[PDB]
Nucleic acid binder design. Structure first.
Lengths: 228, 155, 119
RNA sequence: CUGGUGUUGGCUCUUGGUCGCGCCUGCGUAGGAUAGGUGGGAGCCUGUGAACCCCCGCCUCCGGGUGGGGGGGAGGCGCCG
RNA sequence: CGCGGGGUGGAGCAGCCUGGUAGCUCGUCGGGCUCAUAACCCGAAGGUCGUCGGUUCAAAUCCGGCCCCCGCAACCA
């Protein structure tokens, strides 16, 4: 039919009109993660803004207190002592100056792509037309720019994520997995809600937080309470 | 031809491949009875078809006169002080004369030095279907099957 | 919206364009078509080929409307007319029957001087 | 001249533009098709009937997406390419 | 002056909105064609997407300042 038998049974333990604070949501998402693998906890929401202008288009970063649990393979396009700086801190691919010569025919997606301030004249024409809207853009507001490139890679491998606003006007980003207890999920979902409060654009009027959903990869969502 | 139905002029089998069609194409390749340098050219073409494509030249030539024959066309014919461009399938004889003549004309609008390579490179393209000669076939049928409004005057 | 398989198809064939309407059993337009609806304009509308297309187009635009069988009624003259009937048939419809209902005055209004050559 | 109200009351029908949601849709081209967009995903859809054969509601930029009933028995969809 | 819609070949205009697509049409021009021309049909010269900076690994697009046209109701000491 329209739905399933492993999906719909999850539509019995959650009332949409019953606002489950991140505690009755972090206790109920522990009974939504039924999968061969270990799911995640997709955290979504609809902000009170306008995604068509550039005064309220929220974006940035934020480290979650417990992390995620899903390892991300971060690489680099260094310049100087920032080639051995990302290789002492822990990086898969690093300072090869222009290793853009390998990735120009093929490639089966690793995870990340960082750089630095001086390789901006040609770090736009080589691999600036490929990963573009493929969310791997070395955007400095995204957190992938700077001479401190090996210092920004020990937190994206140990917790920190990225929440960007899309064309429509919402804010996504995972805050853990499905095997994370009621303490690791609920406390973490609190260090990402400040990231939407503190990064809250200026020209945005009204009650910024219209909604804040929290579900599980292949499971139903809960219109969780905003601050708690 | 106002009395008898004209009279189909009869060709003379091609001395190398047999077919009468062959010599006909040459008759067009020709200018001023220079039937030799005329004939000559046609073959030299095949020598390229042979080296450029391991396909028998004849087998190619035939298939190039085919993929070009225009199945229908437009011919003027007034009825009431108006020149409609009525379309009607074309005689299987004219259906050949056209294709042949065009393959020749086209083969002379290409930027190729020796005449040989022209008739050759062209033919090879008439078969594949992508040629300047194949072109008219298309632009002569796009004509009819467009003016198919005046069809009803099929004299 | 509503969908009914039984129908009635009208052929108003004139001189400058053949036109056809397809109604329901009560005679209410479900959809219509004409030499103008198709790409044609001007004189080549009155031509039969146009009539055919019009009929076909009318059929399909009537078919996907829940049609299956129609009652044909022609009116007028002009080339197109004929082709139009034959077109409705070999087109996928069901010509249940054809009638020739051309309007004729039992001598009423005087016609224009064009139509009055019949002095 | 005119809109709103007051004097101004009964009885059904019709139907918008908001806003309560329950719910339903999307395609230039290259491309097996009809890929709105961001985030998640290496996994789920079937014995509460899957490949397909028959029928209808619906939508149409008419290729085809969509969802229920009824034949039938175990095969689908995607990562990857 | 406050509000908001966009400048794109010679001209206009879809793309924007929903990121990476110079697409639609006529003039131009070589040619096919026909008595002649339009239509039809192939091929091509012509777009810094107003401009300037940033956001962009990529911007006609998101975009901050901005040149100018349009629309707009008010006001006018």
């Amino acid at each position: 039919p329209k739905h399933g038998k492993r999906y719909r049974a999850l539509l019995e333990k959650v009332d949409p009109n019953k606002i489950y604070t991140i505690d009755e949501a972090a206790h109920l998402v522990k009974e939504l993660a039924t999968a061969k693998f270990d799911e995640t906890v997709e955290v979504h929401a609809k902000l009170g803004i306008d995604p068509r202008r550039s005064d309220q288009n929220v974006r940035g970063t934020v480290s979650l207190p417990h992390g995620l649990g899903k390892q991300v393979r971060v690489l680099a396009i260094a310049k100087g002592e920032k080639i051995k700086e990302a290789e002492e801190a822990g990086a898969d691919y690093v300072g090869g100056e222009e290793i853009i010569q390998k990735i120009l025919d093929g490639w089966m997606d690793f995870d990340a792509v960082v750089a630095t301030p001086d390789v901006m004249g040609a770090v736009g024409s080589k691999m600036g037309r490929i990963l573009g809207p493929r969310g791997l853009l070395p955007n400095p507001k995204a957190g992938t720019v700077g001479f401190n490139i090996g210092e920004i890679i020990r937190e994206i491998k140990a917790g920190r994520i990225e929440f960007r606003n899309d064309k429509t006007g919402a804010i996504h980003a995972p805050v853990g997995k499905a095997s994370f207890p009621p303490e690791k999920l609920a406390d973490n979902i609190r260090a990402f809600i400040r990231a939407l409060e503190a990064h809250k654009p200026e020209g945005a009027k009204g009650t910024f937080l219209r909604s804040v959903y929290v579900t599980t990869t292949m499971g139903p969502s809960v219109r969780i309470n905003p601050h708690s | 031809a106002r009395r008898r139905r004209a009279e189909v002029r009869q060709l003379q089998p091609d001395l190398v491949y047999g077919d009468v069609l062959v010599t006909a194409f040459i008759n067009k390749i020709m200018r001023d009875g220079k039937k030799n340098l005329a004939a000559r050219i046609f073959y030299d073409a095949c020598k390229i078809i042979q080296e450029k494509t391991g396909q028998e030249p004849l087998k190619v030539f035939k298939q190039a006169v085919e993929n070009v024959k225009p199945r229908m066309e437009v011919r003027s014919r007034r009825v009431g002080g108006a020149n409609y461009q009525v379309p009607m399938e074309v005689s299987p004889r004219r259906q050949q004369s056209l294709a042949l003549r065009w393959l020749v004309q086209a083969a002379n609008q290409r930027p190729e030095r020796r005449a040989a390579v022209r008739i050759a490179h062209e033919l090879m393209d008439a078969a594949e279907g992508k040629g300047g000669a194949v072109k008219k076939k298309e632009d002569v049928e796009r004509m009819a099957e467009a003016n198919r409004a005046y069809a009803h005057y099929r004299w | 919206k509503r969908q009914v398989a039984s129908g009635r198809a009208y052929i108003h064939a004139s001189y400058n364009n053949t036109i056809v309407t397809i109604t329901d059993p009560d005679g209410n337009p479900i959809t219509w078509s004409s030499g103008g609806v198709i790409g044609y304009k001007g004189s080549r509308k009155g031509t039969p080929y146009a009539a055919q297309l019009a009929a076909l187009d009318a059929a399909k635009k009537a078919m996907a409307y829940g049609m299956q069988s129609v009652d044909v009624i022609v009116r007028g003259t002009g080339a197109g007319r004929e082709q139009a009937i034959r077109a409705l048939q070999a087109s996928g419809l069901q010509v249940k029957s054809i009638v020739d209902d051309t309007p004729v005055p039992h001598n009423g209004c005087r016609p224009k001087k064009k139509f009055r050559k019949a002095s």
